[PDB]
Amino acid sequence: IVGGQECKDGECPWQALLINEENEGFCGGTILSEFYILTAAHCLYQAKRFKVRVGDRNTEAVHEVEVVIKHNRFTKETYDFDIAVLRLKTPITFRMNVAPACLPERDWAESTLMTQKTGIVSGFGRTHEKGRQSTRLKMLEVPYVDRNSCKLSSSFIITQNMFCAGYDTKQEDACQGDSGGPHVTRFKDTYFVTGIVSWGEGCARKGKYGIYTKVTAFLKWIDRSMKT
């Protein structure tokens, strides 16, 4: 996360971190329930074997994955359908700094959450385009971006499975290592999952926005994935 602020005690409890064999974080995820993590399909190529860490705001509990459910339509070419659900081997114990984000009902999310002014992205990714991963979990409020502005700003096709968020000029954005992590939207003090950090043409580049997987487009898919 470039810019933004440190997540303080209990502020981003739904954050999960995917860590490779060498215990290094490479992608984020969102806690959905005691057994399920939401992440990006593209993250599944960044490591052969990985585990999920929850609860640590400062990299300075670990859960193994039982089942990886990847959207069969994901394409490395367009990043369309960039979503995956992980079922853990052991259930997460909720506590300070460890709690799930809410999944909203689809039509309501579209009319009430996606229409708010901003959402919140978080992660342990780089704090500058060139840099090391953050040892501290960060968060950043990001304005929802008009779909037309979004497509106009982009060198690549923005599908209906994606949405833009961020700033046009102000230098704040998600960045490398944040992929797969939560985009949540607050409504009356309750935080609902609304996006998955997906891709961007660099980090915080002028005239560019962050591109997120639109969770509303996959609510039924997610619900089905959490049953088997």
């Binding site: 005690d9 209990g10 502020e11 409890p13 739904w14 909720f94 506590r95 300070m96 700094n97 460890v98 709690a99 799930p100 984000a101 809410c102 999944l103 909203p104 009902e105 039509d107 309501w108 009319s111 009430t112 949540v184 409504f187 009356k188 003090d189 309750t190 935080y191 609902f192």
Partner: protein
């Protein structure tokens, strides 16, 4: 602005319009309160709440 378009129909969470009237509902792990609008956590660590 009317019904769900007016302050989310006074619902804490999900608002739907059925037969010209507001029906509120809640995420899993919450129960709809007796007033039919508020959502009450069923446990510790209900979804979407900061642990403050």
């Amino acid at each position: 602005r009317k019904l769900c378009s007016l302050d989310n129909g006074d619902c804490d969470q999900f608002c739907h319009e059925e037969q010209n009237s507001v029906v509120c509902s809640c995420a899993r792990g919450y129960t709809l309160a007796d007033n039919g609008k508020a959502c009450i956590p069923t446990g510790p660590y209900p979804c979407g709440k900061q642990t403050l």
